[PDB]
Design a protein around this ligand. Sequence first.
Ligand SMILES: [Fe+3]
Ligand SMILES: [Fe+3]
Ligand code: NA
Ligand code: NA
Length: 336
Amino acid sequence: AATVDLRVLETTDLHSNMMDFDYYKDKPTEKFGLVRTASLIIAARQQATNSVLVDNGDVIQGSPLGDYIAAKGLNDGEIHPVYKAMNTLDYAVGNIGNHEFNYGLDYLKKSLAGAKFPYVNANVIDVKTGKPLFQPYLIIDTPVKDRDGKSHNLRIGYIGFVPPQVMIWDKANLSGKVTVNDITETAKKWVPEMREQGADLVVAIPHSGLSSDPYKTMAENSVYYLSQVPGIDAIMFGHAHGVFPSKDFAAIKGADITQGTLNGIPAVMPGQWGDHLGVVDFVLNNDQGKWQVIDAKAEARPIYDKTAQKSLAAENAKLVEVLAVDHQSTRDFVSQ
Ligand SMILES: [Fe+3]
Ligand SMILES: [Fe+3]
Ligand code: NA
Ligand code: NA
């Protein structure tokens, strides 16, 4: 007879924009940066009794901080500054995006080793073993409180995916070392196993966009097809750098833009560079024994209100201090 509210939070496509600072203009901004998204995370946690946080990928590359560190290397006794930051925000799990491969598998392994949260990816296959190179999924026991304040253990499964097109985009680094299977086929292979192994919920984290064009194997943007795979309870997506739900996707088959669902499944894509936080909310009930989803909604919360022209998320001082040395080193890197 227990009813549990559960919130799933998501960052995506941070692209190493830790600071709310434009290094080319050498000026602060209110419009991007994890130091501002962090404020949305903290606020969303205060509203929700139970919450978990994931990252979709495209995190270690794509802005001056990422360029500075890729050139510097990770052999100086320090972890990547993106993880210096993210390690303080209580992430449950990370997913591998396409740009994570840009500097080679060795740099990726070193980078992920500094993250204080586990990573998943199910579709990258090691050529030498014929089996996944990374951890395809994790089932993570998670304490939750119901609406009466009683505790329960909820087993949350998380599964990750990257576009097969990394084989072209990172041909030098990947060709002959890995292959990458179709996103939807990979989900059909593993989701039944996750549920058989006791996952109460399955959260898919595909670094992949949204299209309702006819399915063709190896589709880069496979979220619609994933929404049709049984056993997936939420889809925390990314890669397209757009905002879902929004009017931009009203024509997608099966999309309910107000509710943030695709064929009834909640799904969210929170923009780029930390300019939004993804928020999926579930209501779960165990009335017949098993946990069932009785309600599901998704929304992408912006750090900046474009119509009012004002900030909706403060620059977090604690995270600015974590990043201070690396911030000045990034300014030096750009000016050299
Ligand atoms: Fe990206
Ligand atoms: Fe991407
Ligand atoms: Na939590
Ligand atoms: Na529903």
